[PDB]
């Protein structure tokens, strides 16, 4: 198969067992890759790389593109369909961990875990804030959104959210719009402005986990244009940053690999891949 | 009154209102302090400073020593009692926040929040671990211990503890001894060895919140001999450190100050202070 990207060593080993694997990225198998083109039926890739139309046209036998991830911007979905190729993903596997990091970053800002850690490390050794009884506003109550809210309930936080729709079974309150949400939040969780930022007040904080002195802090794991990131952040204050590590756990990556394996053996088994999109 | 230590500006203001306050630590009121000695009935202090016997003997009218804290090693309890002095504390106020930091440090090690934050800040931009389905062993299931366990349940963790006694109402399992606990834990929470450390294995981690390559990490907020702390820590790996910030929140310190105020006005009101110990 065509392995467009490296995945985990042990997702690799699961491949080199069932499959003769040609890695697009390794020079040491460019020849045998070229050879194999007509007898290549499977591509394993990630959301970031996808599979260009050029490469697709190079693979006449290709029947499946298995995406280690849920991103589809890097592959032409309908085009594969017209070539009768199955394009799969790995749904419902990463939200919890993304929600863990969101909470971790939150405690990190709340409790000065960055500023506090360096000051000991920088042999330099300010009161923090408790989450208890504070309004957590959640922007986008999806999978990641719900996970993060319940986790936030354990800290004595009251949940409010923006919405898209209202959720049954919980006592969380829904706000009409994002600014409504901000004016009623002590910590804003972005799980999908200046004026929004301004409505959070000087005690409030923002926590990013999705895409890229008037506020008291921010914990950001995702930024616009990455990783050539603003620069001021590393300088800013009351800021905890992450190299987009939302889903970066062994467990999640292992859960995602197994899914990728599952759609593979399925297709080679004459079946329609279960995670076809 | 005798204010042995600084407390929060607004605990201060609550004092300078009801009380003529002489700060032992400020030179600018050493005279008026000396004067006041015989007409001083109240000391406000913290666990670290207490009130030496020498000073106690200097204060003939003293009827109350209000401790902003629960530490009593820095004051002779029975001696005050024999002088009929009421020594109060501020119980049941800080456990939750100490448990918050314990969890925060945990996520911090689990999810490489230190190593991850600097690498972005150090413009340098390793898979982490999820807590879900991992055994959290709790060493000392007291107030802080219980708070921390429930918070850990929200992350999909299974609670085990060492014990002192068994807790009704929950499905947490009790282990006979500390080493038994270690051999059955993925994260060890110290809330009260080499062999214990060794029983945690190479994936396990230790999180300190109480007193001072064979393990995968550690988050320490309290160390032996502080703050002249080992030094190797700042060098060690997979380590998040805190300048003993267990209780360092505004809310907790505010909750503690109010208690201290309460025992004060009580005693001057001819009553027996409520937090007398």
Query: What's the total helix number of chain A?
Result: 12
Q: Which pair of chains forms the biggest interface, and how many residues does each contribute?
A: A-B, 51 and 51 residues
The main pleated sheet of chain A reads as: 7 strands, parallel
Strand order of the largest sheet of chain A: 8-7-6-9-10-11-12
The computed structural class of chain A is alpha/beta
What's the CATH superfamily of the largest domain in chain A, by name? NAD(P)-binding Rossmann-like Domain
Q: Which CATH architecture of the largest domain in chain A is right?
A: 3-Layer(aba) Sandwich
Pfam families (chains A, B): 2-Hacid_dh, 2-Hacid_dh_C
Domain D-isomer specific 2-hydroxyacid dehydrogenase NAD-binding (chains A, B): 103-246
Domain D-isomer specific 2-hydroxyacid dehydrogenase catalytic (chains A, B): 3-277
Protein name (chains A, B): Dehydrogenase
Describe what you observe in this structure:
- The structure is a homodimer of 277-residue chains.
- Chain A is an alpha/beta fold and 277 residues long.
- Chain A folds into two domains: 1-94 and 250-277, NAD(P)-binding Rossmann-like Domain (Rossmann fold); 95-249, Rossmann fold, CATH 3.40.50.720.
- Helices cover 36% and strands 16% of the residues of chain A.
- Chain A is built from twelve helices and twelve strands.
- Chain A has helices spanning 9-13, 15-18, 30-36, 53-58, 77-82, 95-110, 113-121, 143-153, 178-183, 194-199, 232-235, 250-268; strands at 2-3, 22-23, 42-46, 64-68, 86-88, 135-139, 158-162, 173-174, 187-190, 205-208, 217-220, 239-241.
- Chain A has a seven-stranded parallel beta sheet. In chain A, strands 2-1-3-4-5 form a five-stranded parallel beta sheet, sandwiched between helices.
- In chain A, strand 4 (64-68), helix 5 and strand 5 form a beta-alpha-beta unit.
- In chain A, helix 6 crosses helix 8.
- The longest helix of chain A has 19 residues, at 250-268.
- The first copy, chain A, is elongated and about 65 Å long.
- At the A-B interface, helix 6, helix 7, helix 8 and helix 12 of A face helix 6, helix 7, helix 8 and helix 12 of B.
- Chains A, B: Residues 103-246 form the D-isomer specific 2-hydroxyacid dehydrogenase NAD-binding domain.
- Chains A, B: GO terms for molecular function: glyoxylate reductase (NADPH) activity; hydroxypyruvate reductase [NAD(P)H] activity; NAD binding.
């Amino acid at each position: 198969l065509l392995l467009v990207e490296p995945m985990m060593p042990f997702v690799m080993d699961e491949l080199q067992r069932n499959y003769s694997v040609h890695r697009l990225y390794q020079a040491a198998d460019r020849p045998a890759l070229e050879a194999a083109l007509p007898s290549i039926r499977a591509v394993a890739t990630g959301g970031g790389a996808g599979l260009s139309n050029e490469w697709m046209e190079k693979l006449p036998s290709l029947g499946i593109i298995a995406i280690n991830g849920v991103g589809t911007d890097k592959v032409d979905l309908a085009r594969a369909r017209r070539r009768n190729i199955d394009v799969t993903t790995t749904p419902g596997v990463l939200a919890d961990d993304v929600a863990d990091l969101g909470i971790a970053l939150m405690l990190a800002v709340l409790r000065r875990v960055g500023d506090g850690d360096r000051l000991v490390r920088e042999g330099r050794w300010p009161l923090g804030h408790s989450p208890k009884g504070k309004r957590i506003g959640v922007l986008g109550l999806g999978q990641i959104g719900r996970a993060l809210a319940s986790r936030a309930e354990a800290f004595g936080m009251s949940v409010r959210y923006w919405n898209r729709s209202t959720l049954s079974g919980v006592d969380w309150i829904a706000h009409q719009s994002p600014v409504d949400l901000a004016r009623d939040s002590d910590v804003l969780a972005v799980c999908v402005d200046a004026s929004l930022l301004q409505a959070l007040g000087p005690e409030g904080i923002v926590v990013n986990v999705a895409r890229g002195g008037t506020i008291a802090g921010a914990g950001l794991d995702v930024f616009v244009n990455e990783p050539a990131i603003r620069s001021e952040f590393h300088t800013t204050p009351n800021t905890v940053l992450m190299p987009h590590q939302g889903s970066a756990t062994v467990e999640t990556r292992m859960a995602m690999g197994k899914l990728v394996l599952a759609n593979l053996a399925a297709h080679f088994a004459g079946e329609k891949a279960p995670n076809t999109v």
